[PDB]
Amino acid sequence: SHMQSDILEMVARGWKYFSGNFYYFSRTPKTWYSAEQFCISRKAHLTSVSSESEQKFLYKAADGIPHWIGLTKAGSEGDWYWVDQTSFNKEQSRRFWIPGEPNNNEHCANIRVSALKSWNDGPCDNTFLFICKRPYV
Amino acid sequence: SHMQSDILEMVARGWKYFSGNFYYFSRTPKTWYSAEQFCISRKAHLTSVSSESEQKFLYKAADGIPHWIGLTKAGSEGDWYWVDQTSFNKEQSRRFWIPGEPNEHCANIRVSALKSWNDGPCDNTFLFICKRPYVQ
Ligand SMILES: [Cl-]
Ligand SMILES: [Cl-]
Ligand SMILES: [Cl-]
């Protein structure tokens, strides 16, 4: 009810509700850095992917169009991490990377196929649609 | 004791220490967005400016070279604000904008003078300045 009217407010602002989080699928493309700053300006972050269930929601909604998510590599030689400061599960990510990815500039992940294995490692300065997440509180 | 080794640890990473804060003057240019994400990765933000003495420290060190700072407005129409969420003192700012000033809007320091802030497109590539408070 109060959750229901909060959902209605966010839906009118372009957000989708799923499993206790709000998601913003953008209408225009941005670099990974600019998209993260846009999500911050919306009290959000580029989305993390914490479960197979969340990955399935994201890839279906992304509809085979590249969408930035919030995983980035600390330069070409670092580990991958989530900008929202949840801990990255690199072992499960073997179920999410497109085979052969990360291909290994600056390195940023985007969802680009309508399958479970959908993450691509792409140059962070490419301009793609993007996906913010903000937990419902 | 630990205070001097704390300061020396950041200085050895390439930060300047000035009056209670660490500053990172970058070696490579970036867009404003990429510079802010770099500062975040170092537990920092693009610098705010909250006094005359801080403004003077920054413009002297910037040496007339454009440097991003942490002031922005969302679209040509929002109010200006500091990304580190400190309060923006509009009245004080009038002593820091270049005379005449102020799609994407981001401030950079670009003159070796007190009046040195420029309103520039966020997708320009400039050197930048991070700030991290010293907490003991
Ligand atoms: Cl958008
Ligand atoms: Cl950018
Ligand atoms: Cl640098």
Residue numbers in the entry:
A (entry chain B): 188 to 291, 295 to 327
B (entry chain A): 188 to 289, 295 to 328
Reproduce, without paraphrasing, sentences from the article in which this PDB structure was first reported.
To further elucidate the structural basis of Ca2+ competition, we conducted X-ray crystallographic studies. The central proline in the EPN motif is crucial for the Ca2+ coordination. In this structure, Pro289 remains in the cis conformation while the long loop shows significant mobility, as indicated by the missing electron density, similar to the inhibitor-bound structure. This observation is consistent with previous NMR results showing 75 ± 10% of the central proline adopts the cis conformation in Ca2+-free human langerin. The pronounced long loop conformational differences between Ca2+-bound and unbound states highlight the sensitivity of the long loop to Ca2+. (D) Superposition of the four chains from both structures highlights marked differences in the long loop conformation, with only minor variability in the short loop. A similar mechanism has been described for another CTL, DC-SIGNR, where the loop adjacent to its secondary Ca2+ site shifts between open and closed states depending on Ca2+ binding. Therefore, it remains unclear whether the long loop structural rearrangement upon inhibitor binding is driven either by an induced fit mechanism, conformational selection, or a combination of both. X-ray crystallography revealed the binding site of inhibitor 3 and the long loop sensitivity toward Ca2+. The results highlight the long loop as a potential structural switch and offer a design strategy of future langerin and other CTL inhibitors.
